[PDB]
Design a protein around this ligand. Structure first.
Ligand SMILES: NC(=O)c1ccc[n+]([C@@H]2O[C@H](COP(=O)([O-])OP(=O)([O-])OC[C@H]3O[C@@H](n4cnc5c(N)[nH+]cnc54)[C@H](O)[C@@H]3O)[C@@H](O)[C@H]2O)c1
Ligand SMILES: NC(=O)c1ccc[n+]([C@@H]2O[C@H](COP(=O)([O-])OP(=O)([O-])OC[C@H]3O[C@@H](n4cnc5c(N)[nH+]cnc54)[C@H](O)[C@@H]3O)[C@@H](O)[C@H]2O)c1
Ligand SMILES: OCc1c(F)c(F)c(F)c(F)c1F
Ligand SMILES: OCc1c(F)c(F)c(F)c(F)c1F
Ligand SMILES: [Zn+2]
Ligand SMILES: [Zn+2]
Ligand SMILES: [Zn+2]
Ligand SMILES: [Zn+2]
Lengths: 374, 374
């Protein structure tokens, strides 16, 4: 038995920015009250994890990163009521405390217990469950999935279907749900509309899936890497365009292609310039533009507010606008009922030991999602 | 009869920026096909007219400004079907052609025939109906209401109730409808919500009216001129704050007052800094901020897109989001049935010949709306 004991296990520790993960032994404390210890089964490589490595997103180091995953509960602390040992679970990088004003709001999902705004890199109680070489190691977004075992707060885990294939449904922990919800819930894409999607990685492909599910008539994918276009068309893009191919700015190209601007645009990259381009290419009176990409730390964009005064709507969201603990189990149930596909997002499946090779595939432009298996 | 003849009349001509209007004789050509010549009865002084004088809003000079008005049709050109001589009318600074993709959209109102986005200062046919001292004079937003007679395109005029008091309902041509619609139609303020309104001039007071009509529980007025607070409270503000009174930035003050951010905020001034402040003070996960104020020509704001990524919605609108020709007659009918009040906005009345004194009252901070009578 491991319950109530320290577990020594393998994890991928990030000791400093812009260095490889160190795959080595850590100690994982048992769960305290209202905490859950999870044996990980699969974890995806999201560009947001790479933002920690690159310093695009600032969080305390050293850290166990990883936030897109699925696993099996090993043990629960006193007072846990929502999961039991043996349950399949997805950790929730956006928690759902159920008590804060955001959790109580019909349209809010960015629970005030999140560790994204002012990252502390701890459990809810302000402490860490991880040690490595005698040093405390930070958590990441209350998840820390690049480890054979993690400990999460109960508000940061959802129970899912016992028959779930965890090597696929781990994508419901971030990339699929983010993109799909950004289209269907945040933008509320309408039947017959024209959409533009900037960035055709895992999250942008999931935005395309959602635009197609919502009945968009035209879905224009935009990427500087034309190798991304074939899969974008497979999942619903009707056209793809590469800004590098044009003498005009791409906002002008997209305005022309859409006979005066798109209904819905999505920034799914993480660049200030494409956030402003994406806003500009939506129709000036009734267009909607959604920011999904994570912008670089502490950098402001510049824009002319006449883009908004004419009638545009500009919004952003975390995790597709989904209330995480209510939504994740339903999204898994929908996947099991064949309501959407996840295989188009998975280009590579590697053992966890090859985490650094998986990050190199993402950085080279060669992968959509690599799933790491423990 | 004057039908088919040039009319000589008085108008307020703006020859140069940052100068008084010149009240002098102009020649007003008769209406061409699908044009309407109007004998003006009353016109309001809106801060946007002052933006023409100050070069905040660039439009070609020399010009006859004025856009908030009511009058009586003197004659109609060939093919006009929607008004007749003797009808009471309100000119529409945002037209409603009924044919463009915006007019056909259920939520658009910024008709593509507008002269706001890229001002030419002409009729739809690219020519002027005004001569002064033998020189052609520009139109303004297809309205030019600072004249005893004007000529407008048929898509820029609405027929209103024959029993309308024109010295009141002129406000439905801009300030009332803009503010009220910004709350009820654009923001869609909800019952029990907390609103913050930046700027307590005629348009911000109309925003407060709309927030109260929508059932907001708290309406916080924000102005650096504390003389504006009494009227704001009379029309529904529950609290007023002066940023000058505080050591901390007012976005932090309003976040504290609202226990974590407001539900709806409105920028009703025209400053880049207050546009960003108003966005910041709405709750980060579910808040909505609406830009109403007109920004200085060609100037960009700077902002951190993490304000949107957490969940905020940022939008703007012209004319409260109202489809102008459909909505203006209905707003007049509702005014006649006492569904809203206009007198709280009217602080001063002057004859048209005292237009410069009316602008002096606006610039000193003393007036809300001055109504000029012809
Ligand atoms: N809001 C959220 O909750 C959330 C969730 C998940 C991911 N993210 C962010 O979303 C973004 C996309 O993540 P991902 O899909 O995993 O990344 P990814 O797989 O790296 O995809 C990014 C795509 O953008 C393309 N690209 C780069 N520059 C440009 C350009 N100038 N114009 C057009 N295309 C360009 C690039 O070729 C690639 O295909 C990242 O910033 C993530 O951090 C946000
Ligand atoms: N979007 C539209 O369709 C539309 C229609 C009508 C007016 N406008 C614009 O709306 C704005 C307001 O017009 P209005 O009500 O006639 O103008 P106004 O009567 O000049 O009122 C503006 C108010 O802002 C106050 N103010 C100035 N600076 C600050 C500050 N830093 N903080 C807080 N308060 C401040 C000022 O004291 C005044 O009471 C102007 O920019 C107009 O051009 C837009
Ligand atoms: O990919 C999900 C995700 C985000 F949406 C962020 F905004 C972020 F800062 C982050 F670290 C993250 F992992
Ligand atoms: O006050 C109405 C009004 C506006 F809403 C503008 F955006 C503008 F540029 C302008 F000149 C104007 F008069
Ligand atoms: Zn919460
Ligand atoms: Zn992610
Ligand atoms: Zn139109
Ligand atoms: Zn106005």
């Amino acid at each position: 038995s491991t319950a109530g004991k320290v577990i020594k296990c393998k994890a991928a520790v990030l000791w400093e920015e812009k260095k490889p993960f160190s795959i080595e032994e850590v100690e994982v404390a048992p769960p305290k009250a209202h905490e859950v210890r999870i044996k990980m089964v699969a974890t995806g490589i999201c560009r947001s994890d790479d933002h920690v490595v690159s310093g695009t997103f600032v969080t305390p180091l050293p850290v166990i990163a990883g936030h897109e995953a699925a696993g099996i509960v090993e043990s629960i602390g006193e007072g846990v009521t929502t999961v039991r040992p043996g349950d399949k679970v997805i950790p929730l990088f956006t928690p759902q405390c159920g008590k804060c004003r955001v959790c109580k709001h019909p349209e809010g999902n960015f629970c005030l217990k999140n560790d994204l705004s002012m990252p502390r890199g701890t459990m809810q109680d302000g402490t860490s469950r991880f040690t490595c070489r005698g040093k405390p190691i930070h958590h990441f977004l209350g998840t820390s999935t690049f480890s054979q075992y993690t400990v999460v707060d109960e508000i940061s885990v959802a129970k899912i279907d016992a028959a779930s294939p965890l090597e696929k449904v781990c994508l419901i922990g971030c990339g699929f749900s983010t993109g799909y919800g950004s289209a269907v819930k945040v933008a509320k894409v309408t039947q017959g509309s024209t959409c533009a999607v900037f960035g055709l990685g895992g999250v942008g492909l999931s935005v395309i899936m959602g635009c197609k599910a919502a009945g968009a008539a035209r879905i224009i994918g935009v990427d500087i890497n034309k190798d991304k276009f074939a899969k974008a068309k497979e999942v619903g893009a009707t056209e793809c365009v590469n800004p590098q191919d044009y003498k005009k700015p791409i906002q002008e190209v997209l305005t022309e292609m859409s006979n005066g601007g798109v209904d819905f645009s999505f920034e799914v990259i993480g660049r200030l310039d494409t956030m402003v381009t994406a806003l500009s290419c939506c129709q000036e009176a009734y267009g909607v533009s959604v920011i999904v990409g994570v912008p670089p730390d502490s950098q402001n964009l510049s824009m002319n507010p006449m883009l908004l005064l004419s009638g545009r709507t500009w919004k952003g969201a975390i995790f597709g606008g989904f209330k995480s603990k209510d939504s994740v189990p339903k999204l898994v149930a929908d996947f099991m009922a064949k309501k959407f596909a996840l295989d188009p997002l998975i280009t590579h499946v590697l053992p966890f030991e090859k985490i650094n090779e998986g990050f190199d595939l993402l950085r080279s432009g060669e992968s959509i999602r690599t799933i790491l298996t423990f």
